């Protein structure tokens, strides 16, 4: 089966909002353990991760030179968009307006 990607991700293009309150994050993977599953979470402002909120079902890196688009629905107010696992985690701050 698949392993979880343990390498580091970088933002390839800017996070982008959508008509339906979701965000579009494009990341490029730098590890060599692809194929692997992309770790994804929605840490609130308390640093504690939050439940679900991922719109993409099972995001996977197939080729570390092929960027991977991910769609998420962050909560309102301040949160973090977290791609990657543990020490090599990309922690993107976010604000969703109008709760």
């Amino acid at each position: 089966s698949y392993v979880m990607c343990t390498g580091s991700f970088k933002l390839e293009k800017e996070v982008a909002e959508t008509q339906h309150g979701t965000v579009l994050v494009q990341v490029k993977y730098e590890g060599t353990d692809a194929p692997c599953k992309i770790p994804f979470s929605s840490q609130d402002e308390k640093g504690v991760t939050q439940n679900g909120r991922l719109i993409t079902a099972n995001p996977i890196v197939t080729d570390k030179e092929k960027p991977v688009n991910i769609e998420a629905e962050p909560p309102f107010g301040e949160s973090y968009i977290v791609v990657g696992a543990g020490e090599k985690a990309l922690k993107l701050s976010w604000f969703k307006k109008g709760s």
Partner: antibody, heavy 118, light 110 residues
Framework: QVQLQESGPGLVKPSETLSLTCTVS????????WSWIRQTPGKGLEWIGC???????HFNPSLESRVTISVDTSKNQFSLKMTSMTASDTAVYYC????????????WGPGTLVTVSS | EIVLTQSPATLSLSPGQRATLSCRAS??????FAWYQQKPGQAPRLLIY???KRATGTPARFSGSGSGTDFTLTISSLEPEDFAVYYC???????????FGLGTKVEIKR
């Protein structure tokens, strides 16, 4: 400074279960993949299995049915259970960290020799 | 799944000589192979990874290369402390497994 230390019984009688423990220092086993690997004189290095804590575990199809891994993060330890030990299971058993973002194993324990004998 | 064949079984060279170790794969998986150096009584030590990258502590005289079906470890200027067994290794994607070659034993003439 990531270091691993296997601890085992040396001897295990045939058909009994082998229990080993790996104690890790220099980092927490709550992230990254960690593996058991064994080396026999006649057959070489053989990967046994790995885990990522509270996520998933993968095992060598040859040994899946005899092998389980448990994890005790409060002690930074994880263990190997191998049932129905045979004489051909005599080997040096290693624990190791899987290299983050890579396909290799970047840190290894010194290994513990397991002799299946009565 | 994947089967790695290392050549030659034993290499016996004088210090200062160049040593090339081959790792041939039965089928292509990734282009990112690893090499381990195991000195007597020690665990294997990660030497080269992702086919060509030097692991921490690996001297400059060690280099790796290879395309898809066979990969190469080169020791440019062989030294007595390089007496060891060298293993190549790849991860199989499906079924998922990590697999090692049988090793090339390097002996040092004097």
């Amino acid at each position: 400074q990531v270091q691993l230390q296997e601890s085992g019984p040396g001897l295990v009688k045939p058909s009994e279960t082998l229990s080993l423990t790996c104690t890790v220092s220099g980092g927490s086993i709550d992230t990254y993949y960690w593996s058991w690997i064994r080396q026999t004189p006649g057959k070489g290095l053989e990967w046994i299995g790995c885990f990522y804590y509270s996520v998933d575990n993968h095992f060598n199809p040859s040994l899946e049915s005899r092998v389980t891994i448990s994890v005790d993060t409060s002690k930074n330890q994880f263990s190997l259970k191998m049932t129905s030990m045979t004489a051909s299971d005599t080997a040096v058993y290693y624990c190791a960290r899987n290299q983050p973002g890579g396909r290799a194993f970047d840190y290894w324990g010194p290994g513990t020799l397991v002799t299946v004998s009565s | 799944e994947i089967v790695l064949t290392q050549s030659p079984a034993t290499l016996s060279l004088s210090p200062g000589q160049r040593a090339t170790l081959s790792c041939r794969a039965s089928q292509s998986v990734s282009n990112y192979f690893a090499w381990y150096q195991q000195k007597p009584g020690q665990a294997p030590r990660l030497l080269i990874y992702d086919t060509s990258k030097r692991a921490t502590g690996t001297p400059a005289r060690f280099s790796g290369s290879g395309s898809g079906t066979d990969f190469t470890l080169t020791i440019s200027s062989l030294e007595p402390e390089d007496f060891a067994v060298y293993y190549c290794q790849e991860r199989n994607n499906w079924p998922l497994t990590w697999t090692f070659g049988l090793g090339t034993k390097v002996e040092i003439k004097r």
